[PDB]
Amino acid sequence: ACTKNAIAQTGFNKDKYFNGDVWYVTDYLDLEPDDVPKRYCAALAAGTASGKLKEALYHYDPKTQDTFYDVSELQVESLGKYTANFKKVDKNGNVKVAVTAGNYYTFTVMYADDSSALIHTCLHKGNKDLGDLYAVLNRNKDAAAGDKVKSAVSAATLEFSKFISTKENNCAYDNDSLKSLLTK
Ligand code: HEM
Numbered sequence: 001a002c003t004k005n006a007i008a009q010t011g012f013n014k015d016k017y018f019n020g021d022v023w024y025v026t027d028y029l030d031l032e033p034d035d036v037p038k039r040y041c042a043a044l045a046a047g048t049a050s051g052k053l054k055e056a057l058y059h060y061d062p063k064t065q066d067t068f069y070d071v072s073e074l075q076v077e078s079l080g081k082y083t084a085n086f087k088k089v090d091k092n093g094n095v096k097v098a099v100t101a102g103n104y105y106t107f108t109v110m111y112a113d114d115s116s117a118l119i120h121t122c123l124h125k126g127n128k129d130l131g132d133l134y135a136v137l138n139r140n141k142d143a144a145a146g147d148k149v150k151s152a153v154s155a156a157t158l159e160f161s162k163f164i165s166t167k168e169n170n171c172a173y174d175n176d177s178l179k180s181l182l183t184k
């Protein structure tokens, strides 16, 4: 179960973050890791489409090859804090699992600038028991975390050395699909 009420960035710039571009997860901190963790790569695009805030997600396990995409409409709870109902889709946006009430994540942008961000998410999926996940994002997929986002990790009272890097996974990403999914 999740335990954190993450605080959104003061002065969060929604239009800059939700600009239609891709964010790559470069490091993450799962507060309830499995006995045996599945080391996934992940990326998202976040944008507005025809007036609706949207996110498209990509997950890829470079060992098992499990790969899935999702599209969500976000609903605003406060500045920088959203509730997202997801539908699983193929890369083209065709629906594989429809939206349903128990399947949603919260998302909070704790820090962002033009190139980097720190987010919190709490995933709810059916009768699964899932915990908090923090992620460091970058606009460039293998960028090492710079000083601004690492300071934000500290200011959240987290220890960056606890985070797991995705940078030495042989991660590959379909960034064109993520962009086009925003409309689906
Ligand atoms: C590298 C960081 C991440 C890792 C290691 C990771 C890992 C996973 C795993 C293992 C699952 C499968 C859960 C299950 O069904 O048992 C999953 C599902 C999911 N994750 Fe992540 N995740 C990451 C980042 C994210 C982010 C940043 C978001 C939100 C923006 C997110 C949203 C979701 C959603 C919505 C599902 C369910 C999708 C579906 O069933 O259609 N994940 N994640």
Ligand SMILES: O=N[O-]
Binding pocket: 066, 067, 068, 088
């Ligand atoms: O990756 N199985 O939807």
Ligand SMILES: O=N[O-]
Binding pocket: 121, 123, 133
């Ligand atoms: O673990 N992905 O929310």
